[model samples]
Target: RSVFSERTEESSAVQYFQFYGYLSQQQNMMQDYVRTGTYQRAILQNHTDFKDKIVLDVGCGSGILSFFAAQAGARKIYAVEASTMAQHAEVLVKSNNLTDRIVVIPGKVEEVSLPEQVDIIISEPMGYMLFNERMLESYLHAKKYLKPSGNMFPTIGDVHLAPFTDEQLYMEQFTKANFWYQPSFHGVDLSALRGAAVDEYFRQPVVDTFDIRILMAKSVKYTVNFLEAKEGDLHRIEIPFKFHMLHSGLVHGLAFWFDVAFIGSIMTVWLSTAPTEPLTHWYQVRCLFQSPLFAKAGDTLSGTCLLIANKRQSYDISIVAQVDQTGSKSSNLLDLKNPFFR
Candidate 1:
């Protein structure tokens, strides 16, 4: 049985690609040194992996990864992109005098055809929470064109969940809805509307970074191996987790983050959006509870996080958590439906 009550219309693929075609979005991603630097280092530092090899870069925005592969001595690189950004990527390839080695193809990786099987496939297909935009589907599709013994740049990805306590952050969310709770607002009785207002404010996940100290417990994580992941494997995922409190505090919400590893033949590189690591464009995602729960050290919080990908490839996430504190137990639920833009 699904947790969602009803399905909503999914966004179109055209709109999805158009969003990436914008330079502002590309700039936002490229400016994240933690993200770009990792990919660059993963390829450049492991020159042996790219030397005279044929590479395919899925969703190659601005051709950066393709350029990196070229610099690492790739014999040829097919940079596939489904947006108009591919035109800009072509210009960059020409300006950098890499036109001979890098070819920018403007089509979805699943729809496009490559001349030959690639020795390596590299992509930054991660979205918020690691599964929001469902771009990993395309990355997995590209695997069909890989050589028998080919490699994936990001061989492994792990999504982590931990309980957090932040009075200020929780209050901010509460106050947004609290405004309606007043006896009267501008000569109107708005208290009656506070119920819906509260739902609206807490229903969406907050996409921002928080201090690591706010975490009340150790995180549990689920790993996805690109080499072994199937297309259907991404459609729906259930991650069951149990968090043991390390500090006594109010559990205001759950914090989610991800880290991917590039297991190169010679050296491995990691790009993490964990709060403990340097900030990236992907930052951390938070789902706040309407009413915070108080828990003490040694207490346990268990739950199953459901990630359901819609037709448009966006996700609807829900967390059903149970808190076991000493002699009492309580449960809380958080839902973020189609919460992608943030």
Candidate 2:
């Protein structure tokens, strides 16, 4: 229930963390990026491979990625940050004595003007669950500023889904919506608020890290090539899945995560935020179903997970699960049959 009402809009995808003058979520996550060095390695090696390349750093926080590009011998680096953090980046760039090579611009990437097309565009725009903050739109929008043959750092991105069973999550999250209607709390009746409370809980997506063992099967939902992506890509996303039970348990929901990879003609550097992989600031995204479907050993669950972007610029997600009985034909197990816009 904690909210940052004081936060100001930096860009459509990011916020002004300094509005409250304290370390915000993005700042804390920057620490994780430094320790993991997942992204650092790609930018470092790529810039080294193409020395003196012109670079564009979108959503440049603290100008660290720009500095990385600079350290790798980039001739020029345009570090664009929408937040007030750009002010600090300017000071930091001078302190590091690279002001001559780096230009810190305080503006949104979609609106900011670059001197010329860039050889590479570097950005760490992946949000919690990948789509919550809609950074994909901004990154894709900036492709116009890239050179015709330009490459995107952490280029290709994807979302993967797996059938999962988490009883704890069902109890604490999905079913808790029914608790307010329990006739009485303490000595008073507050059941009137239950309907609204339940809908709110069901509508809100839960953000957390789950155990890999809970997975039944995994599939890549969708992947986008940054260099060629368009805004319309967000409107429709549908991925089919067939889950062969690995663990005997009730299928409660679908858990998903994102993977990003920097690609060259002959090489790639990848990063995954899956539960099985090392932790990143972006924890896996979890979507709970309306009801739990039971499945055991040798049972296969098949369905299509549909994710549609609503008018509010967020995803309205649902799934269809059908149980393929052993030695028999399949039957529709669950139909989120109609469009359920959030």
Candidate 3:
């Protein structure tokens, strides 16, 4: 099993406290990164002036972006945050004496009122895969308060994908091995749920990895449910982008992650290597389905995948898999292309 109970960074206040506290005990990796960022480094590439324009930081967190706006000579800056981090931002505003021009507003983005219209809206409101963040609907509704021509951060995402074989890397070391599983309690031999073996489970090796641009803003989180299907079943999916600020990231879309299963041989693979040596990492990962249905957990996996980006700005990925289970199809959303289509 893994150490953390879930994937990616948790955005929930409680989870932040729990995980960040431990990370702090190890070393404050995200502290300063949160406290400061060069204005040009944090915001957009081209910036003229907000000297007379109003700016709002959706999830200001530490007021860092607000401070960036202040440093950039903004007329007025509204630092909005819904986390305990807002308290720190308030203090920073006061310490810098930028309180007059920069106000820390403790409230959710959707529930707040702007005295007037704003020229730009900024935020680092995104999490890995997008579904892990706060609320997508809130950001979308916040757009109601935006001027007609305003835009979102990392405006678009073009997610892409292809067949590959790297089960040992991404799946074994990066995924399975890291998770914590509890099967037997009182010396019960409930090892059937062990769910994994050694490195061989992820030894599939990555043969291909194409980009999948989700076409959604980087500042939102959402969940897309799937239906049980058989192999060779074609599917179409759609996602939207709507972040307030600008960050140079991928397709601004969400990526899907699925594991290859094997029933007879039961071999799951991923691209895994020593964390110390990142570039040296290489593996091919792919799955196969049995037929007449899609493969689920505890099944065999292998297949061909097709990714289709649509006009509505969403992406539809179809996996014609060769599974080991007595089924027909497979369903896997491509989650690797949020920051870029590449």
Candidate 4:
């Protein structure tokens, strides 16, 4: 048999996309407990009354957002998810006696058809750090179905980054083990910081900035770049946790996420800045690095991120993330998530 075979023909259902998206934002009750304190609080604390407005929940993983909309007194809510989670959302709305108010549709946002126009559209189409998940296409598709005079929450975005002084990360992974080993040939254990960084391990996460806006349901077709602040200008970094997992991952770069609010009459989502809560059903999305980077504790670092939206045809390239005692990092860090925003 061949080592690999591409399924050129459509034989059966296949999810080329990741499966993790199918589960709720908080997969288990434990997860809920961990993440609820932050994101949930943000939503509940900020939720405004709808009384009788139409709402849409994009990527309605476990019906949480749908429930949020229902409790807000929405006349009708459509929880749109392109995966199996729709079935679970259906049960939730039904059990909550919100069957008439909430409808769970299982398919891509672009594929859904509504009998009438909606007042608002919300979703958690964020990828790692905001650019990983190619969701511009999804939102753009949803826009075609929205009313014209709709408003876009999170109308703008601010990618933020700051230089960090970290030797703990560099020290843990790499140490010059002078040939004290029994072996006669080895001199150094040069496996310098390979896995997740120490800062992330402890989750002493700080916010740089996370404001990003992708015009309501439009293709990913833009280029944004910002200068890395000089050492003195560098201030802070922000990291909004989707779950309180150990965060045992490398701090290669920042991930992206957003929620948008329409004008209470039209639904709009621009990735540039997704309202934290009380605006739309925006969920957290993250982007991870293909490989981690290593820098000494005192080294001055910088970051840059770029997002292109077109269908699922987008790429997040950290053009210049590097530790420079003299200059900047590789990419521009967008300040998208923060406690205040949350």
Candidate 5:
């Protein structure tokens, strides 16, 4: 199924607010956005550019970014939201006396009609680990409503990767999952489902806050520029990385995160989900290897990670780990594919 082809369903939209409205604190980094004033600082610091320009806020939850654009002096602003949160955004806009300048639309940008092309599009469309929610489709779709020379805030998104060691995370994830088919009750041997459990846990990317110390070596590998990025880009995301081990340790997982930035403006702004950086709700995405690799200092780990949309709407990822001749252990290669997901 096409990622962008999915229509705006009230059910999915409601699901987002149910999570956002009820348990705002549960979301790790959302509070960070408010506390650090990261997004606000980014918008205001670059206000000169967006000022007096027409703007669009995709997924304007609570109309925050919409208010940001208006504060930056946008001549006209369209705050398009696909969820029931649009009502809340409208109320907030009115309370802030932005009703005359901002229009809160309650529908998908794919279905919403704007009176005129926008000069700038601002959005925080990242989901768990940056791609899980698949909200980029809406932002990309809204690109059509942008002027030919228009720009997008956070114009660039780069994904970073590195080798990591997390024995506790590895054991706990597998052990908890393995319990499903272990110790049969009533003499019913359902161990046959053990393989299913393994596939289930292995295939799913674990999104959690990990320790930066676990990272052996890190580097930015792949970047997507929203200015020229297309929907097809998400279909086949390939990020190649090479890590040099600093300390002798075991490697069991690949840690991934994305950095969103606005490059075209005078002051580039960024919201990074890096483990080493200020925490965000999406701390980092982990793809664990079934059999962890043992390595020594100065060992080089190199490989490419491929992420593709599976039969299910979620993504299927394959990580290929290649050890270099410099390592103590004979050079060995590894590959993990997301064989299934529910």
Candidate 6:
């Protein structure tokens, strides 16, 4: 059965918010101190930018960011959310006696109309691997409702990539599929299914936290400046990089992480999910290769990471890595074909 074939974009948006409406989901995000604290400081610390300014919080989950702006003395705020959580946000606003300053609008940003252009826009739209949930598309769309000289809370986003070696993680992949390699299982030959099992495991990227020591070389980055981004920019992202191996090791796969910068008028703050930084709910996305490649010290590994947006608001990733010294190469086409909420 085709699950999304009969669904329209509006339905998809509705489903997206429905998934976010659960308290468990909202609590998980709010519990991430690194993610929540930065937004608080970015607004409260830099009162000059938010004081007496009209602010818009896109996808205002639980109205946390909206409350932060209100605390910063914002004249008015439009807290736009498309889920039932909007009702809860309204309750919080009334309890805090901020109903006069903050308005909770329960509708998608694309479908709902704003009373006036905003002086600033704030949102926590980033997903795993930075683009997984495709929320950035809506965040950028909200830009249309900003004034010409308005500012964005997170003006820039950077995705950092590096080659990593994790023999244990690679071995775990095969071990999980070991049952398929049995010569006889329930009187049927299962050995032939091992190949398919391995292929299926490698097709999806793993979202988890890892030690910084696993990194094999210097990292490279691909940046998206939200202020000047266009709709087409999010359709496909290609990042070409070359890494000189720091030491000889087995390259299991690539590790991907991201950071966003809040360039406020009075203060600038950054929230990074890098392995070296404090851990956030949005951990690192690791793409493992079916066959590990070996490289020597001083060798160069070069490749391009191609991320194509899918209909389900996820990404299909392809990575091709070529080693200069050993002349060995490996490529994997990773995808999020399964509908799993980030």
What is the number of backbone collisions in each predicted candidate, taken in the order shown?
0, 0, 94, 69, 2, 0
Please tell me which model should have the higher TM-score, number 1 or number 3.
1
Q: TM-scores of the models, in the given order?
A: 0.91, 0.83, 0.49, 0.52, 0.86, 0.94
In the range 1-342, model 2's lDDT, one tens digit per residue, is 101112113242343334312337446766796323877787676655446888888878788788888888889889988777788889899999997789998876766778798888888877655664555776777788888888888788888878788888767754578777867778778789887765556555556787788887655467877877885685566778877777777777777788888885446888888787877666676676656777777788887877675433356666777767743222212212121222
Please give the lDDT score for candidate 1: 0.84
Q: Rank the candidates by lDDT, best first.
A: 6, 1, 5, 2, 4, 3
lDDT of each candidate versus the true structure: 0.84, 0.70, 0.40, 0.42, 0.72, 0.87
The number of the candidate with the highest lDDT is: 6
Angstrom error at residue 263, model 2: 1.4
Per residue, candidate 1 scores C-alpha lDDT tens digits across 1-342 of 111112213256667788999999999899988899999999999888999999999999989999999999999999999889999999999999997899998887877878999999999999888987677888988998999889999999999999999889878888878998988777888899899888778877888887799999889989999989987798889999889899987888889999999999888898889999998888898888878878879888877888877765677666777775553333334444434234
User: lDDT by residue for model 3 over 1-342, one digit each (tens)?
Assistant: 111212223344355434423424213323433213323343422344345567777766657677777776778887777556667778878998997888887766656667876766665433322322323333444555567665443232222222222223233333443333445557555445444432223222223333222212122222221112111121233433222312222111122332111111122122111112122111112321111232233444334444453322223334454444454444434322222211
Q: Which pairs of residues have clashing backbones in candidate 5?
A: 29-281, 154-261
Error of 1 at 31 (Å): 1.5
User: In candidate 2, which residue ranges exceed 4 Å CA deviation?
Assistant: 1-26, 34-36, 186-188, 192-195, 310-313, 324-342
Q: Could you arrange the candidates by TM-score from highest to lowest?
A: 6, 1, 5, 2, 4, 3
Candidate 4 lDDT over residue span 1-342, tens digit each: 110112111221233234544454447422644233333333334355345777767667787766766766778888887667678778777788888998888776656677777766655544434443445335544655556654222233344222222334324322322222223346544334323332132222222233333111111212221111221121222222111112222344333343222222223323233333332223433332223444444444343333332222233232345544434333332222211122
Q: List the residue pairs that clash in candidate 2.
A: none
Candidate 6 local lDDT, residue 232: 63
